[PDB]
Design a protein around this ligand. Structure first.
Ligand SMILES: *O[C@@H]1[C@@H](CO)O[C@@](CO)(O[C@H]2O[C@H](CO)[C@@H](O)[C@H](O)[C@H]2O)[C@H]1O
Ligand SMILES: *OP(=O)(O)O[C@@H]1[C@@H](O)[C@@H](O)CO[C@@H]1O
Length: 478
């Protein structure tokens, strides 16, 4: 019995091109359309769902040859959804200068300039053997291939269409194939019974945008949706009171934040940014809106970093007196400052913002909410404060301090953070030295500079909750 699944989601990606879809809402869809060379075993080493041992997927085996090169032996007779066989040429193209990390590629895939490893051109040895190379040594290649940067695209078809058009009609090797995409509304995918792996267990999957969480909860209760995403702990008691429904919650390796358009004069200098940061009472927000289930990290520092996690690092500061001193020290004259939020695309975005407006009013800053619907984002020239999140997608502190906040990232490039010279030199250093006392200490200096400059303000790691019918035993919501 294969049912058609209807999933009520918090958002829909602007594209289904796998890298440009990187976001809180894209991967749950693109993970079903595309495959990677290797996958993480989420339950390896006794881990409760965040395990890291690597297992075969499109690559049946792989061997690290040297500190710059990894050879992947590919599964044979794997078919893209259009009937073309996947070969080493496709894998090579996926990680090529032309598609991903070269100068022209970064104009259409901005993450290819910040989220790429220091790749050199892949080498195709034969139809089913490819070597992934880096210009400088890195141990991260294999784990990177299991990440959201590693989804394999079809060379001929992708190159013919180009990145943007491919994103509207994606072709992959995954267990579901593309059917329909209605911008800011829905995505439909269908079972690919030509899949190389386990046969898909649903006939079709529809991801439908339901912007308000109470409407998602109501749709699950009425039977309109089989699964709904992005709920909060507050919704769990009501849902679990229905014997045919259930919730699942867990801390995610992602942090919610607010950030600034530092091209705006009000945020070109650190004092007012740091004043807004020091006025945030995170335990109060977590206690009021998250049932004390969201986690407050000790800085830009998460256990999944492994060798670059500092378990002894101090907490992020809360200092009303210093925030009040920094508002008056800045030229701040009482002019209202907008904070843009796409509703509750981030769980509790609007109630958290209303609480922070009160905290900011108490230090003399007037912040006004600007709540917009999907696709109605302001032009950057009209964005002042906004919310965002970062997924901590590697077992190394390189992600996201360096790949989002470093010199090649969007916080400096698009949003105008003039990072101190020491910060950008430390970014360069950590990316060229192995795990060691020096690298560990360098990441702590980066964390210290991040808190001093406040290009963004970490709020917490959300306790993500999804809900589903109990009789729906497979939930493609990643
Ligand atoms: O973290 C999201 C980031 C992804 O690049 O962009 C934002 C806006 O700053 O969201 C946009 O992109 C996603 C992914 O395509 C869409 O689903 C959103 O609707 C769009 O606002 C961040 O929220
Ligand atoms: O949805 P969103 O918060 O904007 O996505 C972020 C993405 O922009 C990048 O920071 C990685 O983490 C999340 O997916």
């Amino acid at each position: 019995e294969r049912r058609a699944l209807k999933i009520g989601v918090n958002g829909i990606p602007v594209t289904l091109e796998p890298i440009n879809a990187i976001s809180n809402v894209g991967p749950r869809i693109v993970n079903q359309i595309f495959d990677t060379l290797v996958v993480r075993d989420f339950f390896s080493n006794g881990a409760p769902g965040n395990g890291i041992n690597l297992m075969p997927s499109l690559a049946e085996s792989w061997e690290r040859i040297d500190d710059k090169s990894v050879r992947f032996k590919l599964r044979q007779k794997v078919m893209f959804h259009d009937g073309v066989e996947m070969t080493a040429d496709d894998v090579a193209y996926t990680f090529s200068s032309e598609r991903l990390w070269g100068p022209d590629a970064i104009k259409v895939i901005p993450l290819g300039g910040s989220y790429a490893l220091d790749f050199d051109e892949p080498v195709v040895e034969d139809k089913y053997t490819v070597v992934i190379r880096t210009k400088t040594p890195t141990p991260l290649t294999e784990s990177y291939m299991a990440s959201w940067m590693g989804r394999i695209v079809p060379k001929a078809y992708y190159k013919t269409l180009g990145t943007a058009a491919f994103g509207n009609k994606p072709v992959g090797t995954g267990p579901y194939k593309f059917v329909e995409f209605v911008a800011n509304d829905r995505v439909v995918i269908e079972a690919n019974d030509a899949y190389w792996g386990l046969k898909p267990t649903a006939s079709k999957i529809t991801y439908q945008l339901v912007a308000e969480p109470a409407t998602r909860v109501a749709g699950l209760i009425s039977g309109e949706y089989d699964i709904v995403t992005t709920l909060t702990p507050d919704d769990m008691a009501l849902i679990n009171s229905y014997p045919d429904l259930e919730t699942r919650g867990n801390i995610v390796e992602n942090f919610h934040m607010f950030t600034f358009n530092m091209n705006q004069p009000v945020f070109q200098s650190k004092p007012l940014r740091r004043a807004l940061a020091l006025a945030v009472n995170r335990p109060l927000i977590v206690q009021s809106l998250w049932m004390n289930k969201a986690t407050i990290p000790n800085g830009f520092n998460f256990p999944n970093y492994g060798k670059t996690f500092d378990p002894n690092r101090r907490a992020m500061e809360y200092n009303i007196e210093e925030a009040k001193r920094l508002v008056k020290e800045s030229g701040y004259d009482g002019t209202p400052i907008t904070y843009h939020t796409m509703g509750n695309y981030y769980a509790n975005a609007v109630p958290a913002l209303m609480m922070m407006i009160e905290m900011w009013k108490q230090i003399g800053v007037t912040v006004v909410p600007k709540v917009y619907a999907p696709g109605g984002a302001p032009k950057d020239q009209d964005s002042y404060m906004r919310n965002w999140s970062n997924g901590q997608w590697m077992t190394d502190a390189w992600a996201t301090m360096i790949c989002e906040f470093g010199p090649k990232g969007q916080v400096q490039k698009r949003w105008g953070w003039k990072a101190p010279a020491e910060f950008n030199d430390l970014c360069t250093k950590v990316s060229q030295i192995p795990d060691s006392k020096e690298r560990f200490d360098a990441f702590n200096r980066l964390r210290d500079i991040f808190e001093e400059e406040a290009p963004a303000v970490i709020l917490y790691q959300p306790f993500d909750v999804y809900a589903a019918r109990k009789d729906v035993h497979w939930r493609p919501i990643s």
